[PDB]
Structure formats: structure tokens, C-alpha cells
Amino acid sequence: DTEAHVPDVYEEVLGVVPITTLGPRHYCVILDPMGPDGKNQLGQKRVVKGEKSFFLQPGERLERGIQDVYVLSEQQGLLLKALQPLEEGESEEKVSHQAGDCWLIRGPLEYVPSAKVEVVEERQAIPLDQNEGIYVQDVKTGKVRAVIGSTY
Amino acid sequence: YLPAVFEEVLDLVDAVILTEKTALHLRARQNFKDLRGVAHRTGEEWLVTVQDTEAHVPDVYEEVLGVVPITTLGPRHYCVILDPMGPDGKNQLGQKRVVKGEKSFFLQPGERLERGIQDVYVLSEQQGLLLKALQPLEEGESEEKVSHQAGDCWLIRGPLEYVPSAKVEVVEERQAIPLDQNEGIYVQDVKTGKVRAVIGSTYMLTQDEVLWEKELPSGVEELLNSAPRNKTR
């Protein structure tokens, strides 16, 4: 609009905001962002990622700032608890996670925790060969399986 | 210049020195048109080099922010430019563009190197680059043409050179292990758990392989006949 704005007599300068830039591996959780109406939707939080760079608009604030992107390998996971239901189109999985159903996302992918979901634990894989395993208690059904053989 | 009745003479501003080694990074204080005939806004930061004017006089409409030396990439070098412009001439912040191949450019206003000019990644037949794809869709990134997903650890090995794209990230070096026949390394394929005990030719761990410990029931001193055994091979 204007690269050199003179503080008008009708304007009081509250401050100058540096540009908040998200790297190619980064996301931020904007607390209280506007919608299209230009009005602060307080309480809400919008996860923004993808090499974007914006200005912290008046009223907006970052939840915990620019932290990192969640990166998991074949041996790494993200045990997530869906603090909001209806995770239908949130990611490519297309499975509609309900409110709070703990579900483990694993594999060669990258994750950005949406406002609905929340990370619980890291869930590092355990290496197991044949005639060796880990006593696993499926706490959803109790049954201890003692899975052996391949890694689990 | 004979001053007029009204001209209060200020300091004599000299033209800054612009060789191809350097570029003058300045910010315009206000709208104007430079000597070359380019409209500039009230704070747009741009670069003037030898290609436009080899000796630029700091204009009254311009404040000199500084002079930037040319950032040159050798034949074996790459740099990760944080916040580079696209074709629009507008700083695409957050992004990072890997630049290599004997190139030499100027750090444009707003741009910055991630960790500077480090080195190119060089791996021999016994060397690898265990990479984790922090972004999915590594389809046309290199000659392999295999579309690595987001974070699938994959090992690139062989007589090649690698430049880690913005999407991918290096994890470890993965030096090869020399093995002859009747000797090997206990390899646990952590993707499937199965310990294979690969012997014979030399073997070096793939994307999903870790040395697996082999415990003996105190029956080791009777087979060795001070130095602890390598209980992983």
C-alpha cells in the first residue's frame, strides 16, 4: 500500500511487526485469526504451513511460535488424539477420526497437527528378530499378544 | 557548481564503488525514478550492480543500507537461500531454494543463506547418504525418478554426487562395512525386524537396517581360544 507511511494525525502507531515467515519445514498456529470478514475470530486457531510468510495481523498471535514440522521415519510415529471429531478431510487418509480416538500415524510421511488433533507421544519403533518379541498388551481389548518375528 | 541564492550546500556525496565483486544494497526513502529509469517505491530494497551502473551515486531518494559481496558457489558447492524472491520480485519468505552448479549471485535484499556455502555431498562406492524426505513428492528431484513420500528413509548409495534439495534432509553417513566369506554383520531389518546375518560379500546397511546385538550364554571365552568381541558382526 505505502512503503513509507507518515503517521497520520488520525492514527496512533501501536508498533511495527516483523514478518513471520514459515520455512519449507515449518508450521505456526495463529491464535485468534480473522476470517474473510476482517474480524478477529478469537479462540480459534489456524495452522499455517507450506513456505508461507505473512504478517501477524492485529489481534492475531502465535500459539507457541514457529516450532518445527513433525518429521517421522519408518521407525517413527505420531500417536495422535483427536481433540475435535470429524477428521474426515484433514489428511490423505480420508478416515473420519472421531473426538479423541487415539490413532497412530506411521510411515514415510510428514505431519502437520491440525487445530483439531493433538500429539501425545513419539512411539519409537522396537527392533525384533525371530524368536524375539515384545509383550504387547492391546489395551483396547486387553489381549496380550507377545508379537515376535519381524520388528514390531 | 556555483550555488544559487537558495541552495544550501550539504556534504559532497561520492559515488559508491561497484565492482562485480560487490553490489550496493539500498532502500529507497520515497517514490522516484532512478537514473536507469525504474520506478521505485517508498522502501523497496533492490540491488544495483555493474550491469546497471558501475559507479552509483547515492541518490537523495535512496538510503544506502550496505554493500553485499558476491556469493559465489564453486564447482563443488551448494547454498540454501532462505527467503528468495520468485519471478514477481517479491520475497517468498519461509521457502528455501538450493542453488548449485558453479553459480555466482548476489544475496538479494531479504535473502539469506541457511548455513552458508558449506560443501557438496560426495559419496564413494563405500559411502552413502541416509536421507529422510521431510516433504513428500520427490518424483523429479533426481535421476532416480522414484517418488519418495514424506519421511520415508531411503539410502542413496553408489558413484554419484548429491545435493540435498529443500524437501530432503540428511540423517547419517552410513559408511560401508567390509565383509569376506564366512564373515558378516548381524543386520536387523528394522522395517521388518528380521535379522538376516548377511555374510559373504561386503554389506552396508540399507535404509532400514541396524546392527543387531548377538548375546552368548557365557560361552565366549571357550570359543575365542582381553579385547572384547565385536558382538554385532
Length of chain A: 152
What technique determined this structure?
cryo-EM
Length of chain B: 233
Interface residue A73 vs chain B (CB under 8 A)? yes
Cα–Cα distance measured from residue B189 to residue A75, given in angstroms and rounded to the nearest whole number: 11
Report yes or no: B156 and A111 within 8 Å, Cβ to Cβ: no
Q: Do A149 and B42 touch (CB under 8 A)?
A: no
Q: Do A129 and B169 touch (CB under 8 A)?
A: no
Residue of A nearest to B61 (CA): A4
A152: buried, middle or exposed (CB in 10 Å: 19+, 13-18, 0-12)? middle
Nearest to A126 by CA among A76, A65, A57: A76
Which residue bears the cell 507421544?
A121
Interface residue A21 vs chain B (CB under 8 A)? yes
Buried b (16+ CB within 10 A) or exposed e, B28-65: bbeeeebeeeeebbbeebbbbbeeebeebeebeebeee
Cα–Cα distance measured from residue B61 to residue B18, given in angstroms and rounded to the nearest whole number: 19
Region of residue B75 (phi > 0: left; psi between -120 and 50: alpha; otherwise: beta): alpha
Phi, psi of B223, deg, nearest 5:
-100, -30
DSSP β-bridge partners for residue A16: none
Q: In chain B, what residues touch A21 (CB-CB under 8 Å)?
A: 83, 93-94
Q: In chain B, what residues touch A152 (CB-CB under 8 Å)?
A: 193
Nearest to A105 by CA among B151, B210, B146, B153: B151
User: Which residues lie below 8 Å from residue B93, measured CB to CB, with a gap of 6+?
Assistant: A19, A21, A22, A51, A52, A53, B83, B110
HSE at residue A123, side-chain half, CA atoms within 13 A, is: 19
Q: Do A4 and B93 touch (CB under 8 A)?
A: no
The cell numbers describing A22, all together, are: 514459515
Write B50-55 long-range contacts (CB < 8 A, 24+): B50/B18, B50/B19, B50/B20, B53/B18, B54/B18, B54/B19, B55/B15, B55/B16, B55/B17, B55/B18
DSSP conformational letter for B138: B
DSSP conformational letter for B13: P
User: Which residues lie below 8 Å from residue A88, measured CB to CB, with a gap of 6+?
Assistant: A94, A95, A96
Region of residue A131 (phi > 0: left; psi between -120 and 50: alpha; otherwise: beta): left
C-alpha dihedral sign at B19, B20, B24, B30: positive
Cα–Cα distance measured from residue A100 to residue B34, given in angstroms and rounded to the nearest whole number: 61
Q: Helix/strand/coil (H, E, C) string of B184-231?
A: EECEEECCCCCECCEECCCECCCCCEEECCCCCCCCCHHHHCCCCCCC
CA A2 → CA A70, A114, B31, B39, B62, distances in Å? 38, 35, 10, 14, 16
The cell numbers describing B63, all together, are: 538510503
Phi, psi of B221, deg, nearest 5:
-65, -30
Interface residue B63 vs chain A (CB under 8 A)? no
Interface residue B29 vs chain A (CB under 8 A)? yes
Cα–Cα distance measured from residue A76 to residue B134, given in angstroms and rounded to the nearest whole number: 13
Cα–Cα distance measured from residue B195 to residue B190, given in angstroms and rounded to the nearest whole number: 8
Report yes or no: B132 and B169 within 8 Å, Cβ to Cβ: yes
Cα–Cα distance measured from residue B27 to residue B95, given in angstroms and rounded to the nearest whole number: 23
Resolution (A): 9.8
Residue of A nearest to B43 (CA): A3
Distance from CA of A51 to the nearest CA of B (A): 4
Report yes or no: A99 and A83 within 8 Å, Cβ to Cβ: yes
**How many Cβ atoms sit within 10 Å of the Cβ of residue B6?**
5
Residue of B nearest to A130 (CA): B194
DSSP β-bridge partners for residue B121: B162
Interface residue B185 vs chain A (CB under 8 A)? no
